[PDB]
Point group: D4
Chain length 163, copies 8
Amino acid sequence: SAPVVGIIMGSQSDWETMRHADALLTELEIPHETLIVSAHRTPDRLADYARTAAERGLNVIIAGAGGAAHLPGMCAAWTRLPVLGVPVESRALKGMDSLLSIVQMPGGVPVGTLAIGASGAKNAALLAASILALYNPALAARLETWRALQTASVPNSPITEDK
Amino acid sequence: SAPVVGIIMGSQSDWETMRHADALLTELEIPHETLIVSAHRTPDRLADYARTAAERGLNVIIAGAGGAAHLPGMCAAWTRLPVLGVPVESRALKGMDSLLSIVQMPGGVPVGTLAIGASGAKNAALLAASILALYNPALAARLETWRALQTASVPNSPIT
Amino acid sequence: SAPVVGIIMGSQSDWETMRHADALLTELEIPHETLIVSAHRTPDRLADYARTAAERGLNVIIAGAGGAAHLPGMCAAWTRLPVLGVPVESRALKGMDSLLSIVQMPGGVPVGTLAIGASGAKNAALLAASILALYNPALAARLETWRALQTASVPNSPITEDK
Amino acid sequence: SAPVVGIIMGSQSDWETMRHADALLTELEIPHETLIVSAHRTPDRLADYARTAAERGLNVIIAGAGGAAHLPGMCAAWTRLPVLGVPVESRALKGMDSLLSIVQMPGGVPVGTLAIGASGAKNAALLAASILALYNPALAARLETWRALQTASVPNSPIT
Amino acid sequence: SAPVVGIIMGSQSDWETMRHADALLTELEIPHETLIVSAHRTPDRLADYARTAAERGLNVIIAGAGGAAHLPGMCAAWTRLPVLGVPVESRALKGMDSLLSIVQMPGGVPVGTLAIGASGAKNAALLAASILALYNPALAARLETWRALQTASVPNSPITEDK
Amino acid sequence: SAPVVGIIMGSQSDWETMRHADALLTELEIPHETLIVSAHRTPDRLADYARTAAERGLNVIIAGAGGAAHLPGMCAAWTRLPVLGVPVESRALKGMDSLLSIVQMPGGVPVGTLAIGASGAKNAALLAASILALYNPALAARLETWRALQTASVPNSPITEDK
Amino acid sequence: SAPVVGIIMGSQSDWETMRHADALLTELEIPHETLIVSAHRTPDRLADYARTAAERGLNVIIAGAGGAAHLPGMCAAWTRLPVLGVPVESRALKGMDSLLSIVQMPGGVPVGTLAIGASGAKNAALLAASILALYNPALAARLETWRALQTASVPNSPIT
Amino acid sequence: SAPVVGIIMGSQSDWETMRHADALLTELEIPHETLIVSAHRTPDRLADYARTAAERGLNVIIAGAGGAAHLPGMCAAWTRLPVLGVPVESRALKGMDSLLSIVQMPGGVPVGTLAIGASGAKNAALLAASILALYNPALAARLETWRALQTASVPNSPIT
């Protein structure tokens, strides 16, 4: 029942993207919490959240941010837990600023970075699931079933119908 | 002790980068295997490697490649294990090709992507350590020590 | 009657782009097949499709994908046939991720890469036609006529009409 | 034996790159010609070369250029033959200029584009080989051997 | 009366951009011609147009194209006249492909390149005007008046009105 | 009452962006002036504005421009005052041209550059405020209150409501 | 004299760049402190440093970092002081990563960003000087002299 | 003979690039002047230079600069003469900054922009020559000869 994944994001405007991570964890029956933590507007909130995450029982953090996207990296600075980063698509630079400011962590403090946007959010949840599945055989079986269904559900040919 | 992390790379030319991952895992006493597996030149080797990884006892795969870098993605396609991707710096485009071809995975098949180059290789090994630490207390304590020493070791001022 | 070109793509969403390759092969009376093969969701389907392509009588493969676009390159890993790659335009990065993940093949495994989007799909079909035309004189004549008409159909001046 | 592939490049400075195409064709015993043809400095040479390519017995043209790289595109404009384009690495922009000015052909006139640099030059020759192999069984068997040896030759682990 | 500037473009779709060059030459009373010449679909048309441009009395060529934009550069290969290049904005890459394929001419064959899009087209006409003005004092006076008016017409402050 | 910050921009079309700087200075009760100065169309206006800014009592200049964005840099060439640059988002290149042409000043003439677009304009005003606050204790207290409110106003969790 | 500018950088490897800021402040006789403070490796050091900067008498902070460069932004998050950011040139991406991760601050927390590299480090110190000059007449006169000498010193023609 | 082309550059560091423009004008016997004029460090020098260019008899200005490259644009702001812009290759961003800050002029004030680097400097001088040739028959014949020799001199095949 207690959360084992934390999904955090800098603002409400990130929710349109991060909701995909939430939905997938729920689908796979992974208890989690979903919070707003602003690296720039609530830096002490971030420090406290990241430094206590492990003792609160969290195993993985999924962090989403856009633009000068510092939330994943700074979270990783304060926790020993694996931190997964979702670059939120930005208006001008289409998430390239988000992507580079998350993935280009210097050696010593990792953030496992996923694709720009909704795909990245979904995949952050799947990656979290695959981490948790290493020690949780029921979840491993649910993930196997999920991946197997994804594969079996791919059609053989396109619907080539003109309109 | 049987390996719990697999480090794979497309070619010898990737080793200058991926050796940083190997060194870090060794420093933390994480049993691992370090292999060349080419998505493009040995696709069946890759398929076999990835599909049997879990049953062989691997927990995490770290995959490095450059250019049109397909090794991490395709590895992830064949395993349920977490796959971590290291973009190797390419000659012309400085690993931007490597980066985009690894990180931009469509929803459904993740690769946790690290920085271009040596930093990414080191961090993939650290990220793998932090994953393993979740269910290995002795390793968790060694990782805590590693992180603590990294933090404590930063000087207060630059030298000239 | 049996197909001599295979058009493959990762998903239905690629069809909006890849249909242009289909239309042009049909226009030039080139028998072909059109399939969905996902590099990431159906990797064994891909392996089987590519490794058997030659014995099934295929001469050219046209492969389209977007984002982390691995389908053309992995197809080329398993076939000795020429593989032509169409970068499908992606939402955030406008097909630059598609383009780099297709064209930047290391030495040893080629993918002949065309333009991002519909233009690339049309041109993949024309390039395939020009390959096939080398051994097929009827098709060579149809291609010559096609290219000649394209040239003769270019207007001499723009319609400069204000609106 | 009359050439069936033409390798053309805009200048001597492209040769460091395009020599990889020449070497590969020679390795596979594909008769070819290797020439300098500048889209910008010898545009009439280019026109003549491209328009007569087919009647001279050429089957594939491999064209290399850098910067505002127009040689492959314009070659394709004048021939019905398949034209393969090699972006040469440029000094400032590392072949991104070369790449975009070759690959982004409008619909109607294709250029099959390979990677920036030596890799692209090698792969253009391989792609040309795979085209020719469709109607030359002996060459198809040599290409099969080449691909098989590439695959079998990849080591299983890196050397230090 | 006879044209002294040639405006050329690859297709009708370029006219939305190149019309700005046409309008400005007309405004400055510069006789010119406006044509479609496709580098890729009518390469012999291009060769003939560029090689005869000087003897036909043209002094400047303004050439517009998008994507793999070869029309300005190839025009310059065949004429000794100054050639001005307008990168037409492309769909996927926003004219960056247009820009690089026009401006990055190797040493020996220049194209004077202007901004991506309508601004570039307007400025190609102004640059042409400034070239012609060197030998044409009536035009020099019209250009001076034009530039002077542009400067005098800039407002001192923005209209800060809320809506 | 007399202005201590100058907000300048190249054209009316920049106002949609620069208005955010104006609004924030007003919010913080910072007297300022807001003007159009075109680097390219009114270069002498710019020279006069920048060279007299200090003697007129200005302490900070906020300059906004897009495309080949020279207004901030040239302002800084003629004043000893701190100049803050706002890259206005451009149509084709999304403000990347704006950004590089403002931030990449060679050593010797600084422009403190903020984010592309509205965010940058808001932050140029906040940065100006933080500069002025160093010598103005009433303003320092208003800025502290503002920053404190920003921090306290961040919600703890997203509104996760489906629609 | 107590420092009124703080120069901070993530690591020794940044010093080759940030030394230009230090030299300029020294040239203008601006008391300052020059420190290593890592956003990623010493986040609590950063928090303390930034939150106490004002009460320690600092007026401006100049922060340099490369790659995923978070030091300036996070410094600004904890201080009301003006923070100036120097993108350090990174190996692979030449400071484009550094630049975007520093300049693209969301509204509410500014960082005044300078050019990638040594130029940016020098200009951050000049920009800090121009800020301090607003309420220090002696410094304003020294900055006027510095700017005047820069202008007067430019040669009229190049040397060969 | 009074100069009819002005070559200007922001600093000595631009000379390695702009010397190619100077050499070409000399080769074609085009009287010119070659000067350092900094948009940022000598803005009044620039204003004077550009505003008096025409009355001094200049016909074309070639302006080179790097980074946030404002010299060509601002020159064009003050003269009715055609201004040609040479993006100097910058250290970090390889002249992409230079290129965008020169070519992306808003409508109303043109700069005819050439390639990044030495090529652009050479081509700015050629473009200036082609402008002058319109009303100088002797020069037009020399330019014809130059272009003809360039074309005729291209080899037919590469050397090894």
